[PDB]
């Protein structure tokens, strides 16, 4: 369904990897929120739908975790 | 030799000194910021510092639909459509919070007013915000874009078919039947163009003004 299941997981690890480098924010809230995002959406999707969701996550990573200090 | 319109004085009983004083101030701002040559119908990108923030800059790109004003108060309007919402900002050339003016695409259009673009189809009003500038040739004459736009249903902002507007950039044939075109010609004043006391000749004024502008350089 996704561009690649490997990329899907790769994205998550990357996000969580940076998740422990934040300073001015609730580190726990970050983890929790992200988990809900991935889970709720990725469980069932189509090629086009899954392509968009993974793409939005990809840009978030490449934008200083969405400017989230 | 392109003399910017704002320098040309309007006729009246105001003293020439009032204009000389203003020109000196106008030339002073131009040295600090260069105001590029542009005409109605050319696409411009204007970067202005927002006063509602901490000197952060804003950018707006659009086609210059109108140019008006004399002296240090001269203005130009330029339109664009953003997420399917038309917007027009009337900028002031000499406002000291205009960081930069870039002529993305320099050209001339059949008319010197493009207000009718409000009633034309959205395509003729939408321009890409991120478009890169097109090349220009200094030792050449500016191109004249002869595009004739297509209008939306008849109820318009104004009666553009009427002879007083003198619009030459609308496809009247498609949107109006010849019966309407004949009827609209009942407001035509043929004598206007042929009465010699209504014409303001600025050739000598432009010649003297051009010399002064170069001399100050």
């Amino acid at each position: 369904a996704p561009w690649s299941r490997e990329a899907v997981l790769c994205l998550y690890r990357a996000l969580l990897r940076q998740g422990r480098e934040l300073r001015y924010t609730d580190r726990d809230f970050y983890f929790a929120s992200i988990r809900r995002e991935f889970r709720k959406n990725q469980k069932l999707e189509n090629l086009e739908a899954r392509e968009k969701q993974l793409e939005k996550g990809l840009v978030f990573l490449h934008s200083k975790l969405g400017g989230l200090i | 030799r392109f003399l910017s319109p704002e320098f040309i004085p309007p006729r009246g009983r105001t003293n020439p000194l009032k204009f000389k004083i203003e020109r000196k101030d106008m030339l002073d701002r131009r040295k600090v910021l260069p105001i590029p040559e542009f005409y109605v119908g050319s696409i411009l990108r204007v970067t202005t510092a927002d006063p509602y923030a901490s000197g952060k800059t804003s950018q707006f790109l659009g086609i210059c639909i109108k140019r008006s004003g004399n002296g240090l108060g001269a203005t130009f309007t330029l339109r664009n459509t953003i997420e399917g919402q038309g917007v027009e900002i009337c900028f002031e050339l000499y406002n000291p919070r205009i960081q930069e003016i870039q002529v993305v695409k320099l050209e001339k259009r059949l008319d010197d007013n493009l207000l009718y673009l409000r009633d034309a189809l959205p395509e003729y009003s939408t321009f890409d915000v991120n478009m890169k500038p097109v090349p220009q040739e200094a030792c050449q004459e500016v191109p004249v874009n002869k595009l004739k736009v297509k209008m939306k249903p008849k109820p318009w902002s104004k009666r553009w078919e009427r002879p007083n507007f003198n619009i030459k950039g609308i496809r009247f044939d498609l949107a109006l039947t010849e019966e309407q075109m004949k009827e609209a010609q009942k407001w035509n004043k043929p004598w206007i163009e042929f009465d010699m006391m209504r014409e303001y000749d600025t050739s000598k004024i432009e010649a003297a003004l051009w010399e002064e502008i170069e001399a100050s350089k």
Binding site: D26, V59, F60, L65, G66, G67, I69 | A53, T57
Partner: protein, 125 residues
């Protein structure tokens, strides 16, 4: 001095939950820093807002102008806009419904925004 570091420490001391700090690129002309923090109840929300404003006036800003407290008529969402920072304090359910974090994190890829399409107006035949 009054800065983001002082504000977050002030918010942490008063024990707010889920404090999120999103930087805003200079391109957007809204604010340098965007702050969202949840609160236990309406009473707690009022206390936090009052404390921050009280500290703000005390903490220098002698030349800098004053800041209004907005949303007092509202019972669950209060927003205070400082010169270069904006803080929104709201209850958990209000935070969940509006999802301010997602919009500013994902500028144009927010799920709610995606659902908002464009249209035109053709005749009916």
């Amino acid at each position: 001095k009054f800065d983001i570091d002082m504000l977050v420490s002030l918010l942490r001391q008063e024990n707010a939950r889920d404090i999120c700090v999103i930087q805003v690129p200079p391109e957007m002309r809204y604010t340098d820093y965007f702050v969202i923090g949840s609160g236990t109840s309406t009473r707690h929300l009022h206390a936090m807002v009052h404390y921050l404003v009280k500290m703000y006036k005390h903490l220098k800003c002698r030349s800098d102008p004053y800041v209004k407290i907005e949303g007092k008529d509202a019972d669950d969402w209060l927003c205070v806009d400082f010169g270069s920072m904006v803080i929104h304090l709201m209850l958990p359910e209000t935070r969940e419904t509006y999802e301010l974090e997602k919009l500013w994190t994902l500028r144009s890829f927010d799920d709610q925004l995606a659902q908002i399409a464009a249209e035109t107006l053709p005749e009916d035949f």
